Design an enzyme around this catalytic site. Structure first.
Site, short mmCIF file in Angstrom:
data_model
loop_
_atom_site.label_atom_id
_atom_site.label_comp_id
_atom_site.label_asym_id
_atom_site.label_seq_id
_atom_site.Cartn_x
_atom_site.Cartn_y
_atom_site.Cartn_z
N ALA A 47 -30.31 -4.35 95.93
CA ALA A 47 -29.34 -5.38 96.29
C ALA A 47 -28.89 -6.17 95.06
O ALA A 47 -27.71 -6.51 94.94
CB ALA A 47 -29.93 -6.31 97.34
N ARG B 241 -20.53 -8.45 100.91
CA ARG B 241 -20.36 -9.53 99.94
C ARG B 241 -18.89 -9.62 99.57
O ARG B 241 -18.26 -8.61 99.25
CB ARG B 241 -21.23 -9.27 98.71
CG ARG B 241 -21.25 -10.38 97.67
CD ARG B 241 -22.32 -10.04 96.66
NE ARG B 241 -22.40 -10.94 95.52
CZ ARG B 241 -22.02 -10.63 94.29
NH1 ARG B 241 -21.41 -9.49 94.02
NH2 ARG B 241 -22.28 -11.48 93.30
N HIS C 250 -30.79 -7.60 88.78
CA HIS C 250 -29.89 -8.14 87.75
C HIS C 250 -30.30 -7.65 86.37
O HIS C 250 -29.46 -7.21 85.57
CB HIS C 250 -29.91 -9.67 87.77
CG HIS C 250 -29.54 -10.27 89.09
ND1 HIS C 250 -29.84 -11.57 89.42
CD2 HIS C 250 -28.87 -9.77 90.15
CE1 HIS C 250 -29.39 -11.84 90.63
NE2 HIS C 250 -28.79 -10.76 91.10
N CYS D 119 -34.00 -6.92 97.60
CA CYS D 119 -34.64 -5.95 96.72
C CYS D 119 -33.84 -5.82 95.43
O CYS D 119 -32.79 -6.44 95.26
CB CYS D 119 -34.78 -4.59 97.40
SG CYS D 119 -33.20 -3.79 97.76
#
Ligand code: ICS
Ligand code: ICS
Ligand SMILES: [Fe+3]
Ligand SMILES: [Fe+3]
EC number: 1.18.6.1
Lengths: 477, 522, 522, 477
Positions: A62, A93, A192, A59
């Site tokens: 994330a 991560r 992003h 999504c």
């Protein structure tokens, strides 16, 4: 090479779907042709995923909190909303950093507002303000706060921008609201985009009037390297050995001061185009800073990138680049001589999404390994434009592949190795096919640069030639 | 630089001199880092009692929680039925997180789908997503049943699951006889165990509510077992083995042990084992129903007592000696089967191990956290062993559970120094283990950071972690363990006593300094 | 000084300042201790290759041996038969030591008697001691059988066991029908496994040698299993479980699992379970006899092939994946029962764990020691895992076993760095782990001291110990583990991978120094 | 009480034995009478064991190597014979020491000759010489070598004395041959005697002509304290607080130099009369050094012992003794206040060979606990003479008890607690009776002195009031 057989395989795999899903998925599967430059005429990307077909995509939360904002070590990131979101993404991560966690660094911690029913019914702006006060009380060495919105924030009528402005004025602290609700967009790529917009609108221009930083003609900034297992450090050591000075790196091991100092550099070196091209173009337009893409996967791409980067500067940098290449040549030559005979001729099918699938192919080719299929979770058409010339003829291309599709393709093609995420690893290990996690490097690495190439070759050898893969069939059956 | 014969990964590659010089220059040049003395002072401040007082005054901020959201538990419950696809109506990022999180815990494939609702569904609802998703999932993955839960998106927009599924059936997207049970699992209510309870109640209501006319209690001579949210395969194995040793007919419901433990033999099995639909349909004909974890099976208890007319026994989780004895005696009373001699011998062997390890176990101080039933069973077992639980934390506990745990603690002299906390997170627990240092912590992998922090204060302040609970990410195959019954208690006792002994060897390994007490025999 | 609220045992009581001052005064005043610089220099010298060369030239001195004497194994073998009293002809100090030594590792009562021979018996022999001891033991402890072994005293003075027992029977000290098998177990030949072999061969001869006329091979449709010297109860249990799962008739011989695992329920049971005399009498009527540990059952193999006319298979110890497969296939061929699906699924699950943990197991270097069959099985399993056995040591091994292990090593690319040592002790192994450092040691509790020594050289030189073998004195209830079969392979793999991960977490716990690699997920 | 009931119990227990064994065993069981000061008329001890009755006794090698010589830290002790002996005796006794193991201290190590068939047939003198050479090569900081014989050494005719003399003269090293073969004697007691004789003959008189040690009127030597769980340390501090100087410490944490310095002290403080009375009497005869027994078990006995010891010196030592008593009074008073209510009225049975069962009784009564039966595997009649006045009327006394006898006595008496060795522990835990390992202090301690009393009380309370003992009966029986 069996190009017709690949199209036949595509048709047989698509036979299972209902008519609407089949018509949609047929546009996301292609047979590679290196001659073709425009990927839109063959493969369609950046579209919504078909319901109920077990996609791999994440999504926008994330893509924003997990990918871009999270590695910033000296800031505190508040997962605003219910508890699950930050809990599942806590320390998942491997964006490495140096600091004292809980004192001046907060990467592996999970800060959340943890909504209950009453916060959903009556809103959570007052609760957000009280949370900001509590954060300032308990973590005095923090250097900024970001508020990452989860789905209910967008769904209910919360206005976190006003709270951010009021509290930031009150506390003389940088508070960045990010509207990264998971239902926005189709994948992490919109995350992003939203994260970079927040960076330009709230952080990047703090020192526009400031000129107390001393600059040199060799000032560069690493953009879009998140230091997965130490990747950014292995790249930065090569950059500094070339004589350059790395003012900032985005965003692995990154600090808010580095981001604020970035508009003063002479060159932007962008590793991940897909996640940071937005801010790179913005800096080029506003500050006149040129930016260029580079690749540090494998010795060939590393040497090419070093030479191209040194070409942007004067002759002393080029001489230092030649010295660096000559210094590191015997090490990666020894690595090749030791590991290539045990990996020569092997075939690999990799699905990572983003930039990695066409960006690590050169490292595999350095070890005499052929990539016969590759695909992305959330790439755009320009990524496939680069990929088509990056891959060989009659290979398989695939965007937002489903679980059924990828399993059938793997059964037919039968690769020697698969590189993908944690949600495919055990499926293909039970199938008897060696698997390497490419998002996390299987909790190993780094793989960037000359030091990382040795680890990469060792890991591929140890998984591919593992004696366990010869023991799945019981002797009595 | 790398040596081809001995290659180094990040550790200890980045301990090289050139990398340290690089990092020092980076920090001194562009990080604008606080001076190390300031950092040390603030860290020392966060280990004080004043910081703890400030920490426990938190009302809006949660730091490092020890719980998840409801749909995770809903998916785990759905995975326990034969050829059943977990289907999560809402956003796809949730399903990606659920799958990765279960994959890291179990190290096995986890199958789950979503209908991938987007901004358009936020204003029009998710009818079309539901229709297309059900059709696509049934066509592609060939399930016998699709179990539907919700993300917080769909819960906030008020999607009506019943209407959506009915409209999908009446317009031909799925067959009318295809079983599609559903449950509302709002993530801003409760936690993952609440989601498990809701999903199970939805499935049971779907299969039994409209066919109670012909059901007679006790006609199939079995006992229903409802395990609840469980992440140890050994618990399912031990419950079945104990029931089979007694010769007692039983029907485990929502058991996923097979699908979470499929062999690696050259094929991928998406489905394996699970509770069959026939078992769920015949469940009201059982003698009675036992809930293994009653504190998060409250809604299931209400349904089973109200509709199936079963007199659900008041039983604690069968953890430790007394509670396992109560569970075995209740099962014997319900089924009319005497307790066999093999279980008597197993209990005696557990008692023998207790007597062997009591000197090393006595008086040790434990902080601990987890889910309510597991926490209370562990506290009960620790009291049975003569150990002292000091900090008992349950982020998803309630006031009634806290009262029950307080009653358990007051019944033993070893509970005099125990405090129970509900709604507190692991940052609170970090303050607790700094200001009132216990001997060990018991909990999931998130405790490792706490251990790191304590070691930063000093070796004499370090509190080692013992990994029991969910999730465990930094060790392999611990999900195969058992924590239920005499076999479960034996494993827990062994782990505890050997953690104590390993710490003692670590503390006495110093040559000519502490190794006078480095005894060969313990 | 003591604080009554927090009382300190020797550690850390003797770390107080007054005790430190006392100890310093004692050392400086009356111990005439060497200067600490000389001590440090000598230790550094002992960790060098020159010291290793001197150490491996030893011909007369043995330091820290890794073996025991024959009567210990004879006693363990005798304990495996029903209502059997182990009787040791000789001196009572031996029996005291055997009982204490088995009590420590087992943590269970061990019954054994002596006839208490003294100087007078050293002059005139032990006839009268044998007569009175047999009478007294039979009257007092009421065994169904008395199995007689010898101490080194009786072996050196040349006591004739057969004549002594016969004279006892003819003179009415014990009834002529009472079974009294005997074996000569000299402590200056072989080791404890040799004693187990001798005792078993004596018992089998006593019950079968004179009654072979009416024996037909294969008439009872069973397979005999001879386990050998075994100190893991799980090994007996898993052999029984796997044989029962295949539906194979079997007769375990010399099994002590019950008498070493009696429950604690308010009474003491001196005898429990064990192979019956009827089983031993009917053993020659089995289809075949399988030896689990053939490298110390050679005399038993000779007797079984020469007298029972059983064609004993050439099987390795069922350890690891390949050898368990071969054992199961041979059992299936002998008995005619197909291998069931449950065992196939267990094998697949072991393979799944292997694929899950291979990235952490690959390339790790191990030094290891133990008994021959256990050592070779462990080496084979480590080769299957991609690990590197570097130093392989067997104090009680021989040259043929060494060739077999070398052949095993040559069949894999992971054995290229391995060296096998027979007749070397743990001081040799200390030199080896200093000069050629492995990642881990695998062995019994006596390895802990070696670990201590390496930690004295530095943290970067410390070799952690993994406790697999006999005896284990400093941990509790590890004797309940399993090393044979798929279950044993699973347990060993879990122990190894989690030892590796625990060491990694230890090395990356330092804040702002190495904790960049302190990953939550591994 | 019920002396008649105890005698009837003795008779019923003896009924099982054959005639010879019954007649012998009847002399080793008795009902206590405190008025009787001649135990010979009441009980027989220090006789050979009856064959086949599962005795608890050890051998002379255990009494010499394991008890007396082994604790000496700076010497290397060679177990001469087959491998079993030293392996079973390696580090099984918690005789604590300070040193660097393998360099200057060798307590926990097993040095052995490891005889094979050829050594039995041809002898082991040449092997012993070569072994001594190798020891000198590989352990240069050793300060002496002792050779402890096992059974075959005495059975085959090996002359270890000549080898010791020749090699000691050759190497200027102290080499002490000990003929402690296990078949000599009837228990560990003859091992004590042999070890003391060897100490007298080869070690004790090495500094008779030496007068370079400076002596004070307050020189004492602790004799017969083997530092179990640091027991001798907890005593020594008290002695050092009273103003005395402890020159030597036999033999726990002891060194050969302390043994050689012992004939220079003013007083010998013997803790274990059974294992060191021989050398104490020899030193009184040869050097005129007085010796006295003391007891540091429990506050009452340690206070009495400190006053008695201080009475041997001038008034300053008495003043320091009273100061020490006053300093330690509150600590043991608090211990009593905490733990006597938990242990008041409980009954204890003891079975340890040698001095500890008589010595521990004062500590037990300090916590209000009654000892109803006691016995020693190897004690002589002099030890029983000391014991009878310290036990109550009509209590059970028993020498070299068999397993059957002790189990039946426990079944009838039903004590609350049993203190014995490791070979009885699990037998009586399975019967449901709390058990404390008296020889090793259950891997805990020390128990000597004021500091040891607190640990003793805590251990007795933790075992006697353990919640496990209430759970051996399952609810459905
Ligand atoms: S940011 Fe992107 S999915 Fe460019 S969201 Fe993803 S640490 Fe991948 S292919 Mo995980 S566009 Fe980075 C990525 Fe690539 S998290 Fe990492 S590996 S180079
Ligand atoms: S030496 Fe003796 S058996 Fe006096 S052989 Fe034994 S360390 Fe005992 S009662 Mo073990 S005469 Fe010492 C003894 Fe007492 S080994 Fe210890 S506890 S005070
Ligand atoms: Fe798996
Ligand atoms: Fe036991």
């Amino acid at each position: 090479m069996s190009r017709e057989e690949v199209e036949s395989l595509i048709q047989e795999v698509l036979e299972v779907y209902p008519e609407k899903a089949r018509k949609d998925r047929n546009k996301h599967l292609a047979v590679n042709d290196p001659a073709v430059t425009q990927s839109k005429k063959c493969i369609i990307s950046n579209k919504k995923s078909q319901p109920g077909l077990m996609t791999i995509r994440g999504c926008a939360y994330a893509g924003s909190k997990g990918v871009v904002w999270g590695p910033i070590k000296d800031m505190i990131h508040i997962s605003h909303g219910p508890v699950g979101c930050g809990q599942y993404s806590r320390a998942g991560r491997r964006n490495y950093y140096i600091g004292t966690t809980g004192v001046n660094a907060f990467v592996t911690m999970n800060f959340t507002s943890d909504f209950q029913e009453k916060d959903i019914v009556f809103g959570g702006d007052k609760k957000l303000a009280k949370l900001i006060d509590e954060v300032e009380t308990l973590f005095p060495l923090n250097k900024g706060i970001s508020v990452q919105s989860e789905c209910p924030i967008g769904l209910i009528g919360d206005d976190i921008e006003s709270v951010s402005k009021v509290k930031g004025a009150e506390l003389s602290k940088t508070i960045v609201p990010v509207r990264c609700e998971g239902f926005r967009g189709v994948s992490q790529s919109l995350g992003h985009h939203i994260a970079n917009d927040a960076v330009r609108d709230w952080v990047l221009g703090k020192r526009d009037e400031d000129t107390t930083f001393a600059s040199t003609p060799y000032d560069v900034a690493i953009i879009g390297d998140y230091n997965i297992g130490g990747d950014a450090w292995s790249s930065r050591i090569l950059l500094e050995e070339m004589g350059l000075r790395c003012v900032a790196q985005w965003s692995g091991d990154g600090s808010i001061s580095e981001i604020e100092l970035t508009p003063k550099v002479k060159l932007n070196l962008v590793h991940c185009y897909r996640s940071m091209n937005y801010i790179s173009r913005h800096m080029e337009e506003k500050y006149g800073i040129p930016w260029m893409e580079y690749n540090f996967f494998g010795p060939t791409k590393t040497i090419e990138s070093l030479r191209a980067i040194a070409a942007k500067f004067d002759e002393s940098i080029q001489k230092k680049c030649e010295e660096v290449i000559a210094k590191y040549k015997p090490e990666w030559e020894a690595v090749v001589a030791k590991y290539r005979p045990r990996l020569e001729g092997k075939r690999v099918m990799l699905y990572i999404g983003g930039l990695r699938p066409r960006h690590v192919i050169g490292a595999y080719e350095d070890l005499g390994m052929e990539v016969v299929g590759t695909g992305y979770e959330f790439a755009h058409n320009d990524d496939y434009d680069r990929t088509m010339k990056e891959m060989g003829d009659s290979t398989l291309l695939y965007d937002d592949v489903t679980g059924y599709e990828f399993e059938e393709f793997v059964k037919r093609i039968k690769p020697d190795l698969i590189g993908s995420g944690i949600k495919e690893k055990f499926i293909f290990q039970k199938m008897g096919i060696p698997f390497r996690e490419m998002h996390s490097w299987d909790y190993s690495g780094p793989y960037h640069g000359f030091d990382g190439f040795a680890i990469f070759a060792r890991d591929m050898d140890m998984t591919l030639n593992n004696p366990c893969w010869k023991k799945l069939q019981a002797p009595w059956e | 630089s790398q040596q081809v014969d001995k290659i180094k990964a990040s550790y200890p590659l980045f301990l090289d001199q050139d990398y340290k010089d690089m990092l020092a220059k980076k920090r001194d040049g562009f990080e604008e880092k606080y001076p190390q003395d300031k950092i040390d002072e603030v860290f020392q401040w966060t280990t004080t009692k004043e910081y703890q007082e400030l920490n426990f005054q938190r009302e809006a901020l949660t730091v490092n929680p020890a719980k998840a959201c409801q749909p995770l538990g809903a998916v785990l419950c759905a995975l326990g039925f034969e050829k059943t696809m977990p289907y999560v109506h809402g956003s796809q990022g949730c399903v990606a997180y659920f799958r990765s999180y279960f994959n890291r815990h179990f190290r096995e494939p986890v199958s789950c789908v979503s209908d991938s609702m987007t901004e358009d569904a936020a204003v029009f609802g998710g009818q079309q997503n539901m229709k297309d998703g059900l059709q696509n999932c049934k066509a592609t993955y060939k399930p016998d049943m699709i179990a539907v839960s919700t993300t917080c998106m769909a819960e906030v927009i008020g999607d009506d699951l019943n209407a959506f599924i009915n409209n999908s059936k009446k317009e031909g997207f799925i067959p009318d006889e295809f079983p599609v049970p559903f449950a509302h699992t709002p993530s801003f209510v409760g936690s993952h165990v609440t989601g498990w309870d809701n999903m199970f109640e939805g499935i049971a209501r779907y299969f039994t509510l409209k066919s109670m006319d012909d059901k007679v209690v006790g006609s199939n001579k079995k006992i229903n077992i409802v395990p609840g949210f469980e992440t140890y395969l050994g618990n399912f194995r031990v419950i079945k083995r104990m029931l089979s040793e007694m010769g007692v007919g039983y029907s485990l419901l929502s058991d996923p042990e097979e699908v979470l433990d499929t062999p690696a033999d050259g094929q991928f099995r998406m489905y394996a084992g699970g509770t069959t639909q026939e078992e769920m349909k015949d469940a009201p004909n059982a003698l009675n129903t036992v809930l293994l974890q009653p504190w998060h099976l409250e809604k299931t208890k209400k349904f089973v007592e109200g509709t199936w007319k079963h007199e659900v026994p008041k039983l604690n989780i069968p953890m430790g000696l007394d509670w396992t004895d109560e569970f075995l005696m209740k099962v014997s009373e319900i089924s009319g089967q005497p307790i066999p001699a093999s279980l008597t011998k197993e209990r005696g062997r557990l008692v023998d191990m207790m007597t062997d390890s009591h000197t090393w176990l006595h008086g040790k101080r434990f902080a601990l956290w987890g889910d309510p039933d597991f926490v209370m069973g562990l506290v009960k077992f620790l009291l049975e062993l003569g150990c002292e639980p000091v900090h008992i934390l349950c982020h998803n506990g309630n006031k009634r559970w806290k009262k029950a745990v307080d009653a358990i603690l007051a019944a033993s002299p070893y509970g005099k120094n125990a405090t129970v906390y509900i709604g507190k997170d692991l940052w609170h627990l970090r303050s607790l283990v700094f200001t009132d240092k216990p001997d060990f912590m018991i909990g999931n992998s998130y405790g490792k950071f706490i251990q790191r922090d304590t070691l930063h204060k000093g070796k004499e302040f370090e509190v080692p972690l013992i990994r029991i609970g969910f999730p465990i990410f930094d060790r392999h195959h611990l999900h195969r363990s058992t924590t239920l019954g005499y076999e479960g208690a034996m494993q827990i006792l062994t782990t505890l006593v050997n953690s104590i002994l390993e710490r003692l060897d670590e503390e006495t390994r110093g040559m000519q300094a502490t190794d006078y007490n480095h005894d060969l025999v313990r």
